[PDB]
């Protein structure tokens, strides 16, 4: 068993021409509003994407280098900072068994797990 | 920063 109601009590009745001057929106207006909602949807993601793509392009460029193949020697820029900066030990602070320590520090970084 | 200080100083309302 069911009860029935008229469908014409639930559908509202309106008058498009009885509305104030500019209440109803035309076609171009609704298309503009749709374009605006799409722009509001994708704006932040577009901007973040560009601001990340800059760094990504720079990183790709730095990756395309891959090493020193293609790079000739240079005399204003040696590879050891001590030669370029004129750094050499003196007399004090010289422990005879400090050389011992020296070795394992090398052995610490030359990666030889013996140590 | 002393060149930019008269410009940045409007964030406090001062001269």
């Amino acid at each position: 068993r069911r009860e029935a109601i008229p469908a014409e009590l639930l559908l509202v009745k309106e008058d498009p021409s009885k509305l104030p001057a500019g209440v109803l929106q035309t076609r171009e207006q609704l298309k503009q509003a749709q374009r605006d909602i799409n722009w509001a949807g994708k704006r932040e993601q577009v901007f973040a994407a560009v601001a990340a793509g800059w760094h990504l392009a720079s990183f790709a460029l730095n990756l395309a280098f891959w090493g020193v193949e293609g790079m000739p020697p240079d005399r204003y820029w040696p590879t050891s900072p001590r030669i370029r900066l004129q750094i050499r030990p003196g007399r004090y602070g010289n422990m005879d068994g400090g050389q011992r320590v020296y070795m394992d520090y090398l052995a610490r970084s030359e990666g030889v797990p013996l140590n | 920063l002393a060149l930019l200080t008269p410009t940045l100083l409007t964030l406090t309302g001062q001269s």
């Binding site: 293609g70 204003y76 | 002393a2």
Partner: protein, 101 residues
């Protein structure tokens, strides 16, 4: 009759596996083709000619090189900047504008 249609429908579903895996294998082929250019003999010929060009270019530009590496900043731009900066600060007296400089 049966086995042929069965292997055919498995052919088509592994073609499906391939369609859900096309961009990855495509970019893999792309990076492989990119890494293929830089192992020929052409690329080592290019590197060696580039070496010759760098040698000829180093022999003709010793003055400009020493200028840009030793002179441009340390003896041309930095002292100008330092004096102008100091005189922009440092109130308009004589002990500060001339004597201490």
């Amino acid at each position: 009759p049966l086995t042929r249609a069965v292997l055919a429908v498995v052919r088509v579903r592994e073609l499906l596996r391939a369609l859900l895996l096309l961009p990855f294998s495509a970019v893999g082929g792309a990076v492989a083709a990119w890494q293929g250019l830089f192992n020929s003999q052409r690329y080592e010929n290019f590197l060696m000619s580039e070496g010759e060009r760098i040698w000829a270019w180093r022999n003709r530009s010793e003055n400009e090189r020493w200028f840009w590496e030793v002179f441009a900043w340390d003896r041309l731009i930095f002292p100008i900047l330092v004096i102008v900066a100091w005189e922009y600060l440092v109130p308009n007296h004589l002990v500060w504008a001339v004597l201490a400089p």
